[model samples]
Target: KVALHPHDLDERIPGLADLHNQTLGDPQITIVIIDGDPDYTLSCFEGAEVSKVFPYWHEPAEPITPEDYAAFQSIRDQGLKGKEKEEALEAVIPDTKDRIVLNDHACHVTSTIVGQEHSPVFGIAPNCRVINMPQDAVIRVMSPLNLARAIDLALELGANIIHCAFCEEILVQAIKKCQDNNVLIVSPTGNVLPGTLAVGAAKVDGTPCNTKEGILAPGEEILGAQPCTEEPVRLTGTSMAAPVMTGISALLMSLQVQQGKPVDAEAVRTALLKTAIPLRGFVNIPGAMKVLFGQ
Candidate 1:
């Protein structure tokens, strides 16, 4: 049901389409869909067209046991039945049915990474392999730990670039480990002041701020696909910005790989900041330079 506005799909969004293609080139770009309701399905789109649908079931209600983990993996690999999906949705968000009108809204925020199409978003790189990691929850009670585990799983599977549009305070040790391992962690800065490395949203005032060293601010009106409709939607927040950065990172990696250089985390960071198109009316260029060059 995800759709894009035909106008936005014209030509201005080459970056969006380029990123989607690059993700497809990696052979390891896994899209993990985390949701509070299992009934929600992931519908990827290329421009305004639908491509794939991943149906899901809920995680167990009790603490996640080994058996539960196995079952979850099986469901991920095999898809899900309607009843099972309903059960899973309830397990993740016990009151989801009561809030049905908000189901799309909730999933829109949590499942940003899973349903994006490869042609428009990823047409630039076609070798990448995409996978799904579904977590059933919004403001998920188990997210802090579960997402940490999810990252670990992505790394274990040899993912060099990770795209996370949602914002959360990660454990310092975990962040450090990701850094040490040379994993490129692209995240949306919480819409709070300052921003996080990856993507950040900036007001039109052009003020200076440093929320996180790696964060980059894209203007608020950047466009992307919206769920349940075919037209593109204008979205704000670091979440909307994160995937754009993720796409840029993928292209950078491809460039480095083509040049026969080792694509490490620092190299990726440098390439992005060095080549990023600065915002004219939104970001303090001087402040951005300090973070990019000082570090």
Candidate 2:
């Protein structure tokens, strides 16, 4: 028999109810997930305690709009390589012949959680729209460049918060650019014990693992979702932790909006580090909070 925490699951964490209640107010915040296989994430959220889960926006064979078709044609003309670029264009406009178009709204990327699984837990702000940019295949090959492009696209689409479950050192400069443009980028600290700001995971002691440099920073912990299941599972990785931070960021953004404060990328980042309960046995870097505080 698998051992479980001996306490009322719902009451395991205090202040959750208050946080959830606060999230109900602001519904305009948009959360964008830049990832490859959205199906796996959606599957994980199935019947779990999340606010919402929408169908994969990229699954349908939608016809491209006239304007978008022309835009993609230009990219193709400019020599866009890789499988994702080719697949994305093919999914939009097959051949130059408009008569061979797929679904009219096939290229119309809509928020998956709009009318489907918009549960209270799945979304931090139920009213907040969620966008999923399926760029996994491209990132696998040309991660740095493709990930940067993905971030640019998300910002262009007016996404307030972007969640990246994976990380690469080469992409740090691009992320800094996003910060300069006032776009908040939420990244998961890697699953490794000694966490760094870019890629570190939480330790079993509810803290970051110790390292030679100093105490590692703690990433978000997966506190099991609602509508709980009893499957044999012990998966631990930054991928799982990223979504948890995404949900928390959504809630924080909602709170900011409710208080009539401007909800920008910098503001959101500041709020997270400021409001986050600092863990014991970690080095409180001097500028770490400052950078996040939008100083």
Candidate 3:
């Protein structure tokens, strides 16, 4: 077998190939992504029903220039690590321009969930509809009030799931509303908060990476489509890991519908945690399927 590239590695790491073989995803299921502005022009989003909702007015930031990208790439190639690398990369952009990077983050995260199957950056749940709700890209800059408003809109949009790459404790009331309506909300480990399913990162070999809580999914060097570019980019962090679990959550919800069972968020969450591999805490799709359907 050919060695799996990191670009195509995240899905398989969580055993999605087997689950995807059964269903691309359910069209009836809708996922609301609360992140940055996404470039809808990407090939990965073709034929997918994508909607945008802005809880607060926000104009799209100017694009990242090729020159800036080149310089950033140069720094990336330098192989620096820790604070030195962070400081070097930070120098390339003005403080205001740093937030523009959210567009790239949004594109990458959304593509991981709803990318077309034939695209180079294919997603796990290609058939599901997606609603993009823009938010601050930086954790420190994130506004809990804005997130609360976004959550309200997600509920109004009838989202079956809400995927927040980040979360804030101040929005606990908004999260409680999601639980009231049985809308599944998936978030990363740090600041995992209650009233949401927590996720962490892992490698193809099921190695955990700083995952302190919840179950593990692929996060390291995860490949995703870049906005306004043909080539893909690789990103690491629990931010990347959250969407993997979100995509799988969509699949499990679809399976419930197929069995004529009510789509229960709690039930799906229980099944996933209960059936996850005990040793490394990796999610096992097949095991979850058995636990849910008893096949």
Candidate 4:
């Protein structure tokens, strides 16, 4: 059995619980995740407004089959490790499209954004619409051009925010497109690039991790949903923190819509940055709400 821990959102953001009590999120606000597949069959994603988009650049050559996946598991059952296992799986599966590896990392990341209240690991913005643009579970299959195509698709689909945990320099053009349209792009601090909200991880003890700039959020030992199991998994990194910030941005945008104000990305970004704790850089959710709602 996988280990579990308390998913304490308020511990990191202080007033996130009170904020969640007010609103989980708004379906009108869409968050695009440029990551791998998230198992939607899990109860955590139940009732969440989520969709999957396959852009032209990373189109699947063919649909995956259960038999193919079972073969993958069979190979794993054999004691192969790392690249050897990857090579063995490929040799047996032959067609890359037939065996598109499912990503546990992505499953955890996506859940942080949209996992429902009843979920073992609750989400930050349960009501927000999520569109996942899938790439290979291993980043090797994705190219800079593929990322650009995914970003373009997200924009065309009317994304309000884009959560890309990984970054590449050539992605600047695509990142700029989101900026041009006033859509927020949240990325990890380690992979921080220009024109994106660089989110850093803050441990449960309130210790900051690599937060030279941008905002700090709870990431250490954070519990999140994983594929093929009801039990949540513990993951720690700025990658985890980026999605939390993404979820917070979604909630803030949702607040704007419910209050009859424009859902302005720049306004939300400014509020989060300005309202964060002075030296620590931790986000103050209620303070941000006061700035956006003027209450």
Candidate 5:
């Protein structure tokens, strides 16, 4: 396993795997995971301070013009089910990009925060108040037109962090809207490359994995919770890594709260970057990204 790789007899380092382990994490923070619906209704949220799970699949929620009313009406009349509803919404709403296909990615993403009991594999920030919003509704909601509505939705709900699991997103203004509301967006550096806004993953071992935009976290076939089965499942990729940093952010957030200090986004970014232990094999992260995660 990539996590254990840090402590393997082949490359054993005493605190390698537990490098991010810390004493404080707060549940009072409300955050959002703009991803797909989980395979199971609930998996890693027993001890979580969750607000609500909003799924666009249950109902499409992007912006609809007077002309698009028919599209919404058609969906209501047809009584579509499953991924078809998502694709149908995409069809009528051509301007929106990316398929709203549902799979099981969110389960793995959430599990990294609070998986099985006594499980060291997950449980990053188990106490944070989570708002699980399926990715599709993000587009349905609106852009610059209804942008403030989007920001108000989270700000009104009290979310400070927004974790997008994918590297490529259909929406940008939606993310910008969240940033406008002073929310920090954490995403993967993505398999392809980088996105212009927010912080991304590094290599799992503090070096560069594939993108210089990221530093590191163990992101291989990480074995942990699944939806249907009570047994743990194996997962890999930057999606897993996103939550690692997300939870770490929550840790820093809790630290601030405990100290009675304002949760300054720029300050946290500075500390994480300034504290990073440079690894031998990675290129330089861009200046923009450095401002994002701090140089």
Candidate 6:
């Protein structure tokens, strides 16, 4: 079982560096982040106890070309190891050049889940190593397939918890792929993201601004992170709340691990929502209610 934050995350924050002290807890459980870019985010984690940083973002080079297969086949035939292997693979899967627009969006999103040095993170698990996955350097738009591919990579990397904040319309197959890997998806309600159409493992959140079915997590008027800053900044909306829950997912997974058991993403989603309290009078389905952080 793995705990991951499959969302766009930034590096620098108030107390983020001090959140995961190596001597405090198991260094294995990591709140892995998968952003659009990695090199740009390295500074944000300079002193933090992050597990690993994989700065890769690629899209499908389709048409099933023979040259593609032949190139890969030859690379495999080489049977290279270590640096040679990586070099060969690099030729096959080149680095992503697409960038994410630099702003406070990622910075705030990341810190909300793991920040803890001078400013406290809403992070649920203490000392859980945070992993960084910078898929791009600039916040930009791409095909729905990219997000799906990202999820696939997350699963391939052994990450079980995946949170997405920049998805458009993805097909059911992609979400199903995540489920096949026992991956849990936590994302926002609208902007009409097809990624939210997941079952069991997907815990979709409906903020005060959306028209959908999910928990009513606190939106706006909250504390968040600022790029290159060591103090908490003022920010709000479902974006912040989403990561709060993301952290909770990882934390809950850690709890399950501590109990000598595997983590059930759907069960954890149930546990949190079952114990949640609604601020408004309830309606039929999973109605709008303030996200009462729970087990």
* CA lDDT of each prediction against the hidden true structure: 0.43, 0.43, 0.76, 0.76, 0.51, 0.47
User: 203-241, model 4: which lDDT tens digit per residue?
Assistant: 887677533448888878877876666778677777888
Displacement of residue 81 (Cα, Å) in model 6 is 54
The clash count for each model shown is 35, 15, 0, 0, 15, 23
Alpha-carbon RMSD of each model: 10.9, 13.1, 3.7, 5.2, 10.3, 14.5
Model 2 lowest lDDT segment of ten: 102-111
Error of 4 at 128 (Å): 0.8
Task: List TM-scores for all candidates, in order.
Answer: 0.55, 0.53, 0.85, 0.81, 0.61, 0.58
Candidate achieving higher TM-score, 1 or 6:
6
* lDDT for each residue of candidate 2 in 258-288, tens digit (9 for 90 to 100): 7677776565444444444443223222333
Tens-digit per-residue lDDT, 58-128, candidate 5: 45555324345345445635878789987887788566333222224666677665443354334566666
User: Whole-model lDDT, candidate 1?
Assistant: 0.43
Candidate 1 lDDT over 151-263, as tens digits, reads 66656656666544443566444555667777677675554211124556553342322333544545355444333433333455556556545544554565456445576
Candidate 5's C-alpha runs over 4 A off are 1-24, 39-43, 55-102, 116-121, 136-152, 167-174, 192-207, 210-213, 279-295
On a 0 to 100 scale, what is the lDDT of residue 260 in model 3? Answer: 83
Query: Tens-digit lDDT track for model 6 on 151-235?
Result: 6666676666776765434545766776665666776543232223211111123324422324445444445544433444555
Model 2, global lDDT: 0.43
Query: Could you arrange the candidates by TM-score from highest to lowest?
Result: 3, 4, 5, 6, 1, 2
Locate the minimum summed-lDDT window of 10 residues in model 6. 281-290
Q: What is the Cα-based lDDT of residue 232 in candidate 5?
A: 57
Candidate 3: tens digits of C-alpha lDDT, residues 1-295: 2223222653456456656666678888899998887878888888987888766455444455656645654665587789987788778755533444665678889999988876768887888889998764332336787778778888999999999865765488899999889999898874244447888887656677623337788888887876666677888888888898898999889878877899898888877777777623788777888888774
